[PDB]
């Protein structure tokens, strides 16, 4: 009844202090993740290249057949370690291009020069959503294979830093025409991935496929979260990889079990057809916008607080 995980977000550090895990503990987590069935491993955190053992960690992903994605800013010593990371079998690179930046270009040019698939990532909001054409030209200029533009904080999970920062319905309708025209314009050259607030949807989307249903986030100290923003929710018992095997955390840790399945649900989700399709929406949005994480996501039209959130 409990599904196998597919992705793993490894926050290796918060650097750009001394409480970070040892190399051997990360190598164990990667091994246990492959044993559970994880496919993708996102090497990130603050700056994953700041780790001295970043090459050995990347090599273990290749040794275990895990698809490694280096989520990095591309600044500082990131370019120095790129050649070694390529040699050990780094599968993919994701450069957050939010726009000093000259050295991001040198890192990006070297990634494509080695033949690695590059993905520019950028966070868009009401202020900088007019910059989407500039991001499209940059991705083509650098020769990236993919371009991500998302109003959410972390791609995959549906959570925002603030509500007033979100873009207009007019801006979303505008950013569809820009992205769709550029998709046809660059069918084979670039892949464009847009994530924006759905102002026409009556029902919400499953956040990361559902709580405790796909992804794991592992903090630098070894704390395992069902999502990046899960520490927002109070009363959750997170387990550490230093005290349990990853499989026991995925299946038995109270933080993962808390909002997994449908037994936790309040109305209207508890008596709803779509309860096992979107899983009540996003827990963190519910908490951040209603005060209780077990509430229905206000993004849903059946939420009683949808009338207030829509006016905001
Ligand atoms: S009510 Fe709960 S389950 Fe039914 S749609 Fe709205 S969110 Fe998804
Ligand atoms: S971000 Fe949607 S569940 Fe935590």
UniProtKB/Swiss-Prot annotation:
Keywords: 4Fe-4S, Iron, Iron-sulfur, Metal-binding, Oxidoreductase, PQQ biosynthesis, S-adenosyl-L-methionine. Its cofactor is [4Fe-4S] cluster. Its EC number is 1.21.98.4. It catalyses: [PQQ precursor protein] + S-adenosyl-L-methionine = E-Y cross-linked-[PQQ precursor protein] + 5'-deoxyadenosine + L-methionine + H(+). The keyword Membrane does not apply. PROSITE patterns: MOAA_NIFB_PQQE (PS01305), RADICAL_SAM (PS51918). Binds 1 [4Fe-4S] cluster. The cluster is coordinated with 3 cysteines and an exchangeable S-adenosyl-L-methionine. Residues 2-189 form the Radical SAM core domain. One of its GO terms (molecular function) is oxidoreductase activity. SUPFAM superfamilies: Radical SAM enzymes (SSF102114). It comes from the Bacteria. Pathway: Cofactor biosynthesis; pyrroloquinoline quinone biosynthesis. It holds the Pfam family Radical_SAM. GO terms for biological process: pyrroloquinoline quinone biosynthetic process. [4Fe-4S] cluster binds at residue 16. CDD domains: Radical_SAM (cd01335), SPASM_PqqE (cd21119). Interacts with PqqD. The interaction is necessary for activity of PqqE. NCBIfam families: PQQ_syn_pqqE, rSAM_more_4Fe4S. Belongs to the radical SAM superfamily. PqqE family. HAMAP family: PqqE. This is PqqA peptide cyclase. The lineage of its organism: Bacteria, Pseudomonadati, Pseudomonadota, Alphaproteobacteria, Hyphomicrobiales.
